[PDB]
Design a protein around this ligand. Structure first.
Ligand SMILES: Nc1ncnc2c1ncn2[C@@H]1O[C@@H]2COP(=O)(O)O[C@H]2[C@H]1O
Ligand SMILES: Nc1ncnc2c1ncn2[C@@H]1O[C@@H]2COP(=O)(O)O[C@H]2[C@H]1O
Ligand SMILES: [Co+2]
Ligand SMILES: [Co+2]
Lengths: 200, 200
C-alpha cells in the first residue's frame, strides 16, 4: 500500500542487533518507530526489580507511540530486540505533519494502540482470573503463532527459555519447568529443553 | 473552549444513565463511541464466575467504547458501569470515522486517552505479577498509604477503603479480602478498623 511507502519515505532506518535496547523506560520520548523487520520484546520491571514481558511486537508494528500525544512524555517501557531488527524512525514533529496530510496513517497507528489496550487488559485480568497452568497454556499457543515459530511434522515448534515464559506469565523458572512437564504429560506439547512442539 | 470537541459533539446524541446502571456490556457488538459529558464510571472485567477487576475510573471529558472503532465486528472488551449519574454523548463508529477524515485532531484527542490507559494498565500488570492475592492486597494498601488523602497516624498511615473496593483492585471476592486483612493485621503489617486501615 502507498500510505505505508509514503510514511517510510519520511523515516530513516536503524539496525539493532539481537538483544540490543531500542528504548529505555524513562527516556524523553521524541520519536516514533515502525518495525520493518524482526521482533522486539516490551519489558517493565516491578517495584522489586523483577522483569516482566508486556508484549512482543513484530514486523508491521509501531513502537514509541505512547509519548506522541501530549508534551513532555517519558518512554513507558524498555524495548529490546529479540532478533536482529530493522526499524524505521521518525520525529514526532514530522509525524504530526504527516498526520495532517493523510489521516489514514494515524488510523493505522491508533488501531494498534486499541488492540494493545485490549490485549494488555486481558492479560491483567488473567493474572487474577487464570492459574499459572492456564496462562502458560495460552502463552504457548500464542508463541506458536509468532513469526519465529516453525512448522513441524507434529505441529508448530517454538524456541524459548523457561525464564522467558516465567517473565511472560509472572512465575519462577522452576514453576515453568514443572508446568511444562504437566502439559507434556497431558499430551498438549512435547518438551525438548529450549525447544517445544505445540500441538495446534 | 475546545472547538474540535464541540464540532464532534454536535454530531452526537445524548443519553442519561442513572447511578449503578451499565453503559456498556462486555461481549456486545461494538458499533458506537461515547464521550462523557457529565459523571463518572468504572471500567471492569470479570472471570467466568463474575468476580470483578476494575481497570479504570473515567469521568467528564473521557471517551468510552473506543476500542472497537478501527475494525467493524468487534465486541466490547469490558463492562462500563455508572458510578454517579452520567450523561454521555454517543455517535456511530461510521460517523466518527468520517469526522476523523475531515479533521484528524479528533482522533488525536481520542488516542491521547488510549495511550494513557495503556500506560496505566501496563503498570497494573507489573504490579500484580509475581504475587498471589495476599501479596497483591499487601501491595495495594502500601500504595494507598502513599496517596494524597492518606492521613498521618501515630502507628503509621491511615487510609479508608472497603473490602469490595480492595477486591476490585486485585480481582478477588470481598470474602477473600476479609480473611486476608485479618491475617495482615495478625502479622503486624496493618491494623484494620472497618473501612479504615493503618498501614505500618
Ligand atoms: N502494554 C503494551 N503493549 C504493547 N506495547 C507497549 C505496551 N506498553 C508499552 N508499549 C510500547 O513500548 C513503548 C515504550 O516507549 P513509548 O512509551 O513511547 O511507547 C511504548 C509502546 O510502543
Ligand atoms: N484497560 C482499560 N483502561 C481504561 N479503559 C478501558 C480499558 N479496557 C477497556 N476500557 C474501556 O471499556 C470499554 C469497553 O468497550 P470498548 O471495548 O468498545 O471500549 C472500552 C474502553 O472504553
Ligand atoms: Co534515529
Ligand atoms: Co444512542
Amino acid at each position: 500500500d502507498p500510505t505505508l511507502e509514503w510514511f517510510l519515505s519520511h523515516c530513516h532506518i536503524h539496525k539493532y542487533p539481537s538483544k540490543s535496547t531500542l528504548i529505555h523506560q524513562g527516556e524523553k520520548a521524541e520519536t516514533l518507530y515502525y518495525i520493518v523487520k524482526g521482533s522486539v520484546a516490551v519489558l517493565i520491571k516491578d517495584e522489586e526489580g523483577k522483569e516482566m514481558i508486556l508484549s512482543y511486537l513484530n514486523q508491521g508494528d509501531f513502537i514509541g507511540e505512547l509519548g506522541l500525544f501530549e508534551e513532555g512524555q517519558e518512554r513507558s517501557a524498555w524495548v529490546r530486540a529479540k532478533t536482529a531488527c530493522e526499524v524505521a524512525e521518525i520525529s514526532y514533529k514530522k509525524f504530526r505533519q504527516l498526520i495532517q496530510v493523510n489521516p489514514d496513517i494515524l488510523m493505522r497507528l491508533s488501531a494498534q494502540m486499541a488492540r494493545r489496550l485490549q490485549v494488555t487488559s486481558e492479560k491483567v485480568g488473567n493474572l487474577a482470573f487464570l492459574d499459572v497452568t492456564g496462562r502458560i497454556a495460552q502463552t504457548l499457543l500464542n508463541l506458536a503463532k509468532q513469526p519465529d515459530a516453525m512448522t513441524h511434522p507434529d505441529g508448530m515448534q517454538i524456541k524459548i527459555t523457561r525464564q522467558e515464559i516465567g517473565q511472560i506469565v509472572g512465575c519462577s523458572r522452576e514453576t515453568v519447568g514443572r508446568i511444562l512437564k504437566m502439559l507434556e504429560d497431558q499430551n498438549l506439547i512435547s518438551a525438548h529443553g529450549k525447544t517445544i512442539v505445540v500441538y495446534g
